[PDB]
Design a protein around this ligand. Structure first.
Ligand SMILES: C[C@]12CCC(=O)C=C1CC[C@@H]1[C@@H]2[C@@H](O)C[C@]2(C=O)[C@@H](C(=O)CO)CC[C@@H]12
Ligand SMILES: CCCCCCCCO[C@@H]1O[C@H](CO)[C@H](O)[C@H](O)[C@H]1O
Length: 252
């Protein structure tokens, strides 16, 4: 009902920039030896710190806040690894031109640490996404929208409490990315981005397989997990292994 307020309201893409979290530090102890146990524990600790900021971000995410508390918690639990790896590839791309894996300003992995972490192939998989960011010259606008799409890429096999509202919100963000890419090779760009998003499901499946394994054997492996991750994984693992998690694809 206000001509002025309507013209001044920031675009959804603009609000995404405003609510994007500041980069979080890992609190990496450079004195300790770079063994798998230490590096994986440090990364899990970093993950806990990041997820606290991700939750605060989702809370002010347009459209998301409108979903039932049950659906929000569910979406965050199902997509945390996807958001983590995607944001990792973005930082590596932005801050090191995809030369290294930039987990945090105080924790940058080169080939040596990827080997030392005991999850080398997984790191290479995430690094490959960063290499695609370079090949595509992905923009921060495209990135922020794609991250929202990842938050909405895995749902309960039987749907959310408000399945209709969710689909509506997902559709709008899809149109947003479609507008950003927007003409000539606009269709091709859109296609490449949605294809990249689909490829995230396979990578995340492998990352989770490893996450769940070190979680079950955390005592024998001496891999530590922060309360935030114990909380997420404890609940996520049984749902995923029971087949209650449904991946949403653009193609296939
Ligand atoms: C979230 C995480 C760190 C924060 C960040 O910037 C990007 C990522 C994505 C990859 C994630 C790491 C972190 O969880 C360590 C792992 C998660 O448990 C590994 C373990 O299983 C260790 O126990 C498997 C995959 C790893
Ligand atoms: C210090 C700990 C190093 C651990 C390296 C673990 C590499 C685990 O690799 C894991 O192996 C398994 C074997 O059954 C699983 O099925 C998981 O798919 C796979 O990610």
């Amino acid at each position: 009902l206000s001509t002025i307020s309507r013209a001044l309201t920031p675009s959804p893409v603009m609000v995404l920039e405003n609510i994007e979290p500041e980069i979080v530090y890992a609190g990496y102890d450079s004195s300790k030896p770079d063994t798998a146990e230490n590096l994986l524990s440090t990364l899990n600790r970093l993950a806990g710190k990041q997820m606290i900021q991700v939750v605060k971000w989702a809370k002010v995410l347009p459209g998301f806040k409108n979903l039932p508390l049950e659906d929000q918690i569910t979406l965050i639990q199902y997509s945390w690894m996807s958001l983590s790896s995607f944001a990792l590839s973005w930082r590596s791309y932005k801050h090191t031109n995809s030369q290294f894996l930039y987990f945090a300003p105080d924790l940058v992995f080169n080939e040596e640490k990827m080997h030392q972490s005991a999850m080398y192939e997984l790191c290479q998989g995430m690094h490959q996404i960063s290499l695609q960011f370079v090949r595509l010259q992905l923009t921060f606008e495209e990135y922020t929208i794609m991250k929202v799409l990842l938050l909405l890429s895995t749902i309960p096999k039987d749907g959310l409490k408000s399945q209709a509202a969710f689909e509506e919100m997902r559709t709008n963000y899809i149109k947003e990315l479609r507008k950003m890419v927007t003409s000539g090779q606009s269709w091709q760009r859109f296609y490449q981005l949605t294809k990249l998003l689909d490829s995230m499901h396979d990578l995340v499946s492998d990352l989770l397989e490893f996450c769940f394994y070190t979680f079950r054997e955390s005592h024998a492996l001496k891999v530590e997990f922060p309360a935030m991750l114990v909380e997420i994984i404890s609940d996520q693992l049984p749902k995923v292994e029971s087949g209650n998690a449904k991946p949403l694809y653009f193609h296939r």
